[PDB]
Amino acid sequence: AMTVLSGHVVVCIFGDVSSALIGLRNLVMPLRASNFHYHELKHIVFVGSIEYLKREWETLHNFPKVSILPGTPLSRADLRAVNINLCDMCVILSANQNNIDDTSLQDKECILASLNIKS
Amino acid sequence: TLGFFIASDAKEVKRAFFYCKACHDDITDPKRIKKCGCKSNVKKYDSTGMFHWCAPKEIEKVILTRSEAAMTVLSGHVVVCIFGDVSSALIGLRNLVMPLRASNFHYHELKHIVFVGSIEYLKREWETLHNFPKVSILPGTPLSRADLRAVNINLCDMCVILSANQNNIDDTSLQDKECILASLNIKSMQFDDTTGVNIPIITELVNDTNVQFLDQDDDDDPDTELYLTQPFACGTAFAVSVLDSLMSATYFNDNILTLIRTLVTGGATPELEALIAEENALRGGYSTPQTLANRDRCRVAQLALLDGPFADLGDGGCYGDLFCKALKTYNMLCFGIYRLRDAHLSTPSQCTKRYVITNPPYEFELVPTDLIFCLMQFD
Amino acid sequence: VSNFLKDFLHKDRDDVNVEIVFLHNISPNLELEALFKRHFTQVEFYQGSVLNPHDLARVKIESADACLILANKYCADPDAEDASNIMRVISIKNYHPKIRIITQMLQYHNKAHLLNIPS
């Protein structure tokens, strides 16, 4: 909340200790591909559980501007203090990919988080 | 204005559309009513002024050991027996403490909640209860009789037994096993200045065929209906099937849920829902005259006829006279009579268990040993 | 079941007009079906719990001379089973109080709950 950081990308992640890795290296690398100037680069702010991002950050720790907001994407205060309204784009990812049953209900905390953002 | 009332027939609810005082002045029966006839910047309350608020303290400030609770006499209080683990699911005790401290009571009138259970469960949940003025934690087991001994269970106000370990797939009639067992453990206790059968307890149960295990001295029927049994009718046994009964009444009237939710939560304004909806934390606010006007709601209480101003009407008094006098003088809606069980008998007994009588008529008599429900205004 | 049946139905027991009726929710396995089909006029199995009043009526618990509750010696939690047997005692004594009940308790501390039951 002290840092105005508009024109940026936030990534809403839903990860646990037990949940499988995605690889966000494949997200940050084409988004910082040395084809943009250093003032042109977008500032990625991850929003999610830090217990998930500590396990993954060992492949993202060579990149010039990236932030972590440890919290929950369903937590509206965390999206409030990330400047979601004057960002560039929000990204909602389904990391908790473990449902065997009811696969039409699998991405339940993605459309719900998107509706939480939109309202 | 839409009026909510307790009737017993549809012909009752029909005759509040039409009522002509010029036509229905003199009256003796429901047959008179016919269709036609006429033509100091101290943080005290929350942001909404609807709940008692405190400073967000540390969990060690509200923790206490066994002998530390034995140092502190804390009578007139509520204890909550919880059965929680690290693995077990959260209940939400925020929905218990908030209507029990609803800014409709004075700060000396508030009851001191002492949770009894595993601290490993309460640490996970206490981050939603840490804004409340007086709450204690006794880390232990409700089955541990020493913990209930050093919490002053005999001279408390009410014990509450909750089933948090809700994970049984098999044998669902055996699911609430450490609730009725803990209640019997409480009820079979002796003390020194008595036997703790007089302790006011309410235990959450999950099965209708399971509720008659609590209070038995008289075999009613093995297959007794849920409303006809003794522990339900005395109020000492809250079944959870009541909630699935709510859905039918919500289907037929859209306002039963609204009435019950405003009655029971003690103020459920949508601004409160919106303020909780953004941070899940009852944040505090300053006090304005707009703020203190918000806590003008009425509460729920019981009234002892013997020591009351209505004591003269206490013996043989018509219920109607008592209701009229209270509404006119103290603006208290007489709400139902909480009558003792062995009061209609002649032999003096020791049974302090009382049952519930809802909306009695004029011919219904009144013994002085009653605890009639009411809706007291806020002075 | 086998040890109890062997001692109760031992030949040296001579003349005892007692018929063992077993009420259990789980259906008997093939070894149980053989063991129950080793005793005809002597052992009857019925499916049902003792936490349902109708099942107690079906087993004629009120007229039954006594009810014996057997606890699985091996279980993940000793206290949980002990509380289940105490629940069964409470159900039977609430149905018909004037009855003898012999039960098994896995823990010595859990025995006090039975004393707490009034009947």
UniProtKB/Swiss-Prot annotation, chain A:
<comment type="subunit">
    <text>Homotetramer; which constitutes the calcium-activated potassium channel. Interacts with RAB11B. Interacts with beta subunits KCNMB1, KCNMB2, KCNMB3 and KCNMB4. Interacts with gamma subunits LRRC26, LRRC38, LRRC52 and LRRC55. Beta and gamma subunits are accessory, and modulate its activity.</text>
</comment>
<protein>
    <recommendedName>
        <fullName>Calcium-activated potassium channel subunit alpha-1</fullName>
    </recommendedName>
</protein>
<feature type="domain" description="RCK N-terminal 2">
    <location>
        <begin position="6"/>
        <end position="119"/>
    </location>
</feature>
<comment type="similarity">
    <text>Belongs to the potassium channel family. Calcium-activated (TC 1.A.1.3) subfamily. KCa1.1/KCNMA1 sub-subfamily.</text>
</comment>
<comment type="function">
    <text>Potassium channel activated by both membrane depolarization or increase in cytosolic Ca(2+) that mediates export of K(+). It is also activated by the concentration of cytosolic Mg(2+). Its activation dampens the excitatory events that elevate the cytosolic Ca(2+) concentration and/or depolarize the cell membrane. It therefore contributes to repolarization of the membrane potential.</text>
</comment>
<feature type="region of interest" description="Segment S9">
    <location>
        <begin position="4"/>
        <end position="24"/>
    </location>
</feature>
